[PDB]
C-alpha cells in the first residue's frame, strides 16, 4: 500500500493455494521449462546425431530407457542457445544437436536457485529460521558439481550425465570403470551421509511411533494428536531409556536430535560434491601406489583392490567404442581384455 | 566379502550377472535411501526451523530443551505453515503421528524391496533386459542407453574371476 | 582361496592390505554351501587357507 | 587495562567431546589409507 513496488509485493505474497512470491518469478518459469523440456525430449526427441542412440517414446524407448542426452563432443561446452551460432534459430536442428540438454541443465539450475530463494522467502514471511533453505544447499552442491562443474572440467558437455533413468545408470558405471569412484573417500562420506540419513529417518519415525502416549481410545492412534497441543506426543524419557539399554547410547536432547538429522545427509551430499569436483579434473582416488608396486613385483599378491581394477579395465575397453563414438575406437577382438572362456 | 573393497567387488560382479540397476526392486531401494536421506534432512530442518525461543544468542539453542520436559519444543503449526506454503497446504503433515509414521515407512519399505531385490536375483530373476529392443525398418539395431549399459556389463563379466571359468557360460 | 582355484586372495592388514582394501575373504568355492566349522578342518592352517573365518563370522 | 566486556566463556560438554573424538578418529581411520597410499 504505497508505490507500485509495494502493490506488486502485496500481490506476489497473497495467501493462495500455490504461493508465488518474488522468488516465484524466477522459480516458476525455470522449473516449468526444465520439466517440460525433459518430458518433450523424452517423448519426441532422438539422440541419433549426438550419440548414435534412440532416446524417446517416439522411437520406441520405454520410461527406463528414454533420456534427454548430452550434445556431441564436438559441441565442447557450448551454451548451445537456440539463437546461437550452432543452431542459428532452427528449432529442429537445435533439438538434433542436443540443445534440450543445455536448455534443461540451465533452466534447471536457475530453477533450483528460485526454489531455494522460495525457501528463504516463505521462512521470512511465516517467521521461522531458514534451516530448510540451508539444508537445500546440499541438493544444489550435487546438481552444480555433477551437471555443470564435472563436464566443464572434462572435454565437453557430452560427458555430463544425460537426463534419463538408464542414462544415469550408464553414468554410474562409467565413473566406476574410469574414475574408480567407489574407492574415493569423498564418495564414501556421501554414502555414509545418505545411508546414515535413511537410518536416522527410519529409526526416528519408528521410535516416535513406538513411544507414543495413549491420548485416545482408538486402536488406530493417528487421531489422538492435535497440532496445537502443548504436550509432546511421545515419551522422550522412555525412548531414551530404550535406546540407552539396547544400543548403549541414546538421544536426550530433542533439539540436538533434529539438528543432527539435518547435519548428516546435508554433510554427506556436500562431501560427494567435493569428490566430483576432483573427478572434473580426473583427479581420482584411482590407485594405492604401494599396492601397485607390490603387485607389479609379486605375481602371487592379490587383494580385492587389484580384482576391482581388472573389472574397471574390462568396463573401459568394452564400453568405450560405443560410449565415446567421436573417438572412432576400433579395438580388434584380439586386444580386448577377457579372462578365460568368457 | 567382509571388507570395503570386497563390497565394491560384490556390487560390480552383481551388476554384470543380474543387471541390478535395471531391477525395479533395487530402484525402489534407491528411492528408499535417497528419499530417507531427503526426508531426514527435511524433518531435521523443519523442526529446527521452528524451535521456540528459549535461549540467548550466546547459548546453543539446544539448552532451550530439557530432557523429559512435558511441552513440545518446537511449533508444528509454524513448521506446517511453512511447508504447506513451500509446496501446497495438503502436501504437508500437520499430524506429528502421521509424519513420523511416514518417516519410518518410506525408508523401511524401500529397503525391504532392496533386500528382496538381492534375495530374488539370488534365484536369477534379473533386471529388465532391453538389449537390442529398438530395431529400424531394415532390422538394424538402434542402440539405446540400455545397450551402452550392456557394454559396461560385458566388460565386468569377461574380466571377473579371470582364471575360474573353463566353459562359455557363467551359469552361477 | 575364495574361488577354489588355488589363487589365494590376501584380505588382512599384516599381509599387505590397508583399511580400504582389507577384508575377511569369503570361503572357498570348493566348499560351496558345505558347512565348514573349525573342527571340519585337518588343521587351523587348512581352515585359514579355505576361508573358515568367513563362515564362522 | 580496563576489562574487555565482549569476552565470553566457551564450553564443550562431554557429549560434544565424544561426538568430536568419534568424528576425528573415524575420519582418520577413513583417510589414513590414502595418506599412506
Amino acid at each position: 500500500e504505497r508505490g507500485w513496488f509495494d502493490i506488486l509485493d502485496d500481490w506476489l505474497k497473497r495467501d493462495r493455494f500455490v504461493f508465488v512470491g518474488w522468488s516465484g518469478i524466477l522459480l516458476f518459469p525455470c522449473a516449468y521449462l526444465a520439466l517440460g523440456g525433459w518430458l518433450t525430449g523424452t517423448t519426441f526427441v532422438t539422440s541419433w546425431y549426438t550419440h548414435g542412440l534412440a532416446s524417446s517414446y517416439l522411437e520406441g524407448c520405454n520410461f527406463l530407457t528414454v533420456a534427454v542426452s548430452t550434445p556431441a563432443n564436438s559441441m565442447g561446452h557450448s551454451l548451445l542457445l537456440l539463437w546461437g551460432p550452432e543452431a542459428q534459430g532452427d528449432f529442429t536442428r537445435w533439438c538434433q544437436l542436443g540443445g534440450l540438454w543445455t536448455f534443461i541443465a540451465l533452466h534447471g539450475a536457475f530453477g533450483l536457485i528460485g526454489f531455494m530463494l522460495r525457501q528463504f522467502e516463505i521462512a521470512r514471511l511465516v517467521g521461522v529460521r531458514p534451516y530448510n533453505a540451508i539444508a537445500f544447499s546440499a541438493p544444489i552442491a550435487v546438481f552444480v558439481s555433477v551437471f555443470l562443474i564435472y563436464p566443464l572440467g572434462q572435454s565437453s558437455w557430452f560427458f555430463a550425465p544425460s537426463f534419463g533413468v538408464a542414462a544415469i545408470f550408464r553414468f554410474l558405471l562409467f565413473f566406476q570403470g574410469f574414475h574408480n569412484w567407489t574407492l574415493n573417500p569423498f564418495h564414501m562420506m556421501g554414502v555414509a551421509g545418505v545411508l546414515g540419513g535413511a537410518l536416522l529417518c527410519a529409526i526416528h519415525g519408528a521410535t516416535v511411533e513406538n513411544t507414543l502416549f495413549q491420548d485416545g481410545e482408538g486402536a488406530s492412534t493417528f487421531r489422538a494428536f492435535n497440532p496445537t497441543q502443548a504436550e509432546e506426543t511421545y515419551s522422550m524419557v522412555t525412548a531414551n531409556r530404550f535406546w540407552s539399554q539396547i544400543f548403549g547410547i541414546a538421544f536426550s536432547n530433542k533439539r540436538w536430535l533434529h539438528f543432527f538429522m539435518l547435519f548428516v545427509p546435508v554433510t554427506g551430499l556436500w562431501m560427494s560434491a567435493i569428490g566430483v569436483v576432483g573427478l572434473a579434473l580426473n583427479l581420482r582416488s584411482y590407485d594405492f601406489i604401494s599396492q601397485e608396486i607390490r603387485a607389479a613385483e609379486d605375481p602371487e599378491f592379490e587383494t580385492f583392490y587389484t580384482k576391482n581394477l581388472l573389472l574397471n579395465e574390462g568396463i573401459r575397453a568394452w564400453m568405450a567404442p560405443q560410449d565415446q563414438p567421436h573417438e572412432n575406437f576400433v579395438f580388434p577382438e584380439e586386444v580386448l581384455p577377457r579372462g578365460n572362456a568368457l | 566379502p567382509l571388507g570395503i573393497s570386497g563390497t565394491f567387488n560384490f556390487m560390480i560382479v552383481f551388476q554384470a550377472e543380474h543387471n541390478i540397476l535395471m531391477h525395479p526392486f533395487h530402484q525402489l531401494g534407491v528411492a528408499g535411501v535417497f528419499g530417507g536421506a531427503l526426508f531426514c534432512a527435511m524433518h531435521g530442518s523443519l523442526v529446527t526451523s521452528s524451535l521456540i525461543r528459549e535461549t540467548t544468542e550466546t547459548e546453543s539453542a539446544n539448552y532451550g530443551y530439557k530432557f523429559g520436559q512435558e511441552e513440545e519444543t518446537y511449533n508444528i503449526v509454524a513448521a506446517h505453515g511453512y511447508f504447506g506454503r513451500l509446496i501446497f497446504q495438503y502436501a504437508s503433515f500437520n499430524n506429528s503421528r502421521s509424519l513420523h509414521f511416514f518417516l519410518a515407512a518410506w525408508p523401511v519399505v524401500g529397503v525391504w524391496f532392496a533386500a528382496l531385490g538381492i534375495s530374488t536375483m539370488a534365484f536369477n530373476l534379473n533386471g529388465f533386459n532391453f538389449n537390442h529392443s529398438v530395431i529400424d525398418a531394415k532390422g538394424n539395431v538402434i542402440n539405446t542407453w540400455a545397450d551402452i549399459i550392456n557394454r559396461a556389463n560385458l566388460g565386468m563379466e569377461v574380466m571377473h574371476e579371470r582364471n575360474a571359468h573353463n566353459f562359455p557360460l557363467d551359469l552361477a | 582361496d575364495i574361488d577354489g582355484i588355488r589363487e589365494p586372495v590376501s584380505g588382512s592388514l599384516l599381509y599387505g592390505n590397508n583399511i580400504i582394501t582389507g577384508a575377511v575373504v569369503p570361503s572357498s568355492n570348493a566348499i560351496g554351501l558345505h558347512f565348514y566349522p573349525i573342527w571340519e578342518a585337518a588343521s587351523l592352517d587348512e581352515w585359514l587357507y579355505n576361508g573358515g573365518p568367513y563362515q564362522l563370522i | 587495562m580496563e576489562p574487555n566486556p565482549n569476552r565470553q566463556p566457551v564450553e564443550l560438554n562431554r557429549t560434544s567431546l565424544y561426538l568430536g573424538l568419534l568424528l576425528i578418529l573415524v575420519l582418520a581411520l577413513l583417510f589414513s589409507s590414502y595418506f599412506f597410499n
Partner: peptide, 29 residues
Amino acid sequence: METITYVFIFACIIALFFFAIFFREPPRI
C-alpha cells in the same frame, strides 16, 4: 608402521565406545 597405525586408531575408537556408554553424561529429568 601402517598396520600399527590402523589398529591403534581402531583401538582408540573401541575405547571411545566404552567411555561414551559407561561414562556418558547421565541423562537427568
